[PDB]
């Protein structure tokens, strides 16, 4: 029952192809719930999960105002950062930002986050104390000095401990049937010969939510870390996620191998075997 909210901002310049594009998305855990795209025919915050749609016109207008101001602010930031690095007006560059709050199973604020990056590299981050900054280089120190003058950290701290938490808890109550429901993985094991003397055992996890899962293979009750091919957890497209883990084993030492599954949705951790 641990929960979090995050907003993700991407601002991208594109010299010769108009003004920089700004897009914001918001998530509770692995569920996206809002988007805004400065490129959209009519730029406005749009709902992306059913439980947010009940919010009134003043919510939507409020979000849209902030994202419209951010679109313009981030356009100036891109100009500023290109200068800080002595970069030419010809290349395309990206500012990213992620921020939000974590709650424990009691619904109390575990910690807040606010981090920004430039061209995929850490640039500036709010420290866990929510009162000071870590700047990555001399360019980021200029941003740090501007941000101290506007008392940004103080503003973030009031938001992260206050509104962020209060709205997260509202979303969690409004979307409780999905947001607070864990769906356990459906699991099986497949066997495929690779040669006469070896076969692939593949342990499958499907239909689970949230995305966090652990899948491991053991040989005689010990971890097979270096020998497991582990695929990135992937979205099914219906809110749920999928993962598999595979090992190549000698024929027929198949029964010495066990797949282990841990997920919040499960009554109990699972131990599975190939069942010929």
């Amino acid at each position: 029952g641990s929960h979090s909210m995050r907003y993700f901002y991407t601002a991208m310049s594109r010299p010769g192809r108009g003004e920089p594009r700004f897009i914001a998305v918001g998530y509770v855990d692995d569920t996206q719930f809002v988007r805004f795209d400065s490129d959209a025919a009519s730029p406005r915050t749009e709902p992306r999960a059913p439980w947010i749609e009940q919010e009134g016109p003043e919510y939507w207008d409020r979000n849209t105002q902030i994202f419209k101001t951010n679109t313009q602010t981030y356009r100036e930031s891109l100009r500023n950062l290109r200068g800080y690095y002595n970069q030419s007006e010809a290349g395309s560059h990206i500012i990213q930002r992620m921020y939000g709050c974590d709650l424990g199973p009691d619904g109390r604020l575990l910690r807040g986050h606010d981090q920004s990056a430039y061209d995929g590299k850490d640039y500036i981050a709010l420290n866990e104390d929510l009162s000071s900054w870590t700047a990555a280089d001399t360019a980021a120190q200029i941003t740090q000095r501007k941000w101290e003058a506007a008392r940004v950290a103080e503003q973030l701290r009031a938001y992260l401990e206050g509104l962020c938490v209060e709205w997260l808890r509202r979303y969690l109550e409004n979307g409780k049937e999905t947001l607070q429901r864990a769906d356990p993985p459906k699991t099986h094991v497949t066997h495929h010969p690779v040669s006469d003397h070896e076969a692939t055992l593949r342990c499958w996890a499907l239909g689970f939510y949230p995305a966090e899962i652990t899948l491991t293979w053991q040989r005689d009750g010990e971890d097979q870390t270096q020998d497991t091919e582990l695929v990135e957890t992937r979205p099914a497209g219906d809110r749920t996620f999928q993962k598999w883990a595979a090992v190549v084993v000698p024929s027929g030492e198949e029964q010495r191998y066990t797949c282990h599954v841990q997920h919040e949705g499960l009554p109990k951790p699972l131990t599975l075997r190939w069942e010929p």
Partner: peptide, 9 residues
């Protein structure tokens, strides 16, 4: 609900 202030970097 998102953070209300935008600040130029």
């Amino acid at each position: 609900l998102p953070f209300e202030r935008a600040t130029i970097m």
